[PDB]
Design a protein around this ligand. Structure first.
Ligand SMILES: Nc1ncn(CCC[C@H]2CCOC2)c2ncnc1-2
Ligand SMILES: Nc1ncn(CCC[C@H]2CCOC2)c2ncnc1-2
Length: 167
């Protein structure tokens, strides 16, 4: 049993809810919240900007030190950092950004990072300002992630479309 509430079950391991990933993290304090990161961990907008704002910029300060030591992530890669006031840990995952011309085949590699964690609260990778089709992102998630993932879909309109169209 876990603390996640109000989710619709899509498969054995994937659950979905119309929710802002930030308010959900604040309520649950999950072991792992996933950030929709870029390779520079520059948390300007989208899910990353919202998560970072909720940490009072502490996520960005920690991230700048990580990049100064390690250099940029790979598209499709990840790193584990603090979850600050939102979660125990934040898994920063880089999905391909279609609005920068990155290979959408890298979306599967991105979701494979989730398999290193038994339970996660996550957004749909490469959705929103990363420019991918969220229906596609949900299909790759279901077909790639084997651990238990609780997806927070911000847009109510999109949430209803994802559920209604799910095979
Ligand atoms: N502000 C900064 N940003 C980036 N780097 C590169 C770090 C690369 C890693 C990779 C292997 O070990 C070092 C910096 N070095 C010093 N200051 C830096
Ligand atoms: N605070 C937040 N800001 C942005 N997004 C992503 C918005 C993109 C669309 C497409 C997939 O889901 C919504 C969030 N998702 C959950 N919480 C979020």
């Amino acid at each position: 049993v876990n603390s996640f509430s109000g989710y619709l079950k899509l498969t054995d391991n994937v659950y979905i809810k119309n929710a802002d990933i930030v308010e959900e993290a604040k309520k649950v304090k999950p072991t792992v919240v996933v950030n929709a990161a870029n390779v520079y961990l520059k948390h300007g907008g989208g899910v990353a900007g919202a998560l970072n704002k909720a940490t009072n910029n502490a996520m960005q300060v920690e991230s700048d030190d990580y990049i100064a030591t390690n250099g940029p992530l790979k598209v499709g890669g990840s790193c584990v950092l603090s979850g600050h006031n939102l979660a125990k840990h934040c898994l920063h995952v880089v999905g391909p950004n279609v609005n920068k011309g990155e290979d959408i085949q890298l979306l599967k590699s991105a979701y494979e990072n989730f398999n290193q964690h038994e339970v996660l609260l996550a957004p749909l990778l490469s959705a929103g300002i990363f420019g991918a089709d969220p229906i596609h992102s949900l299909r790759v998630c279901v077909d790639t992630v084997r651990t238990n993932v609780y997806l927070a879909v911000f847009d109510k309109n999109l949430y209803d479309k994802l559920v209604s169209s799910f095979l």
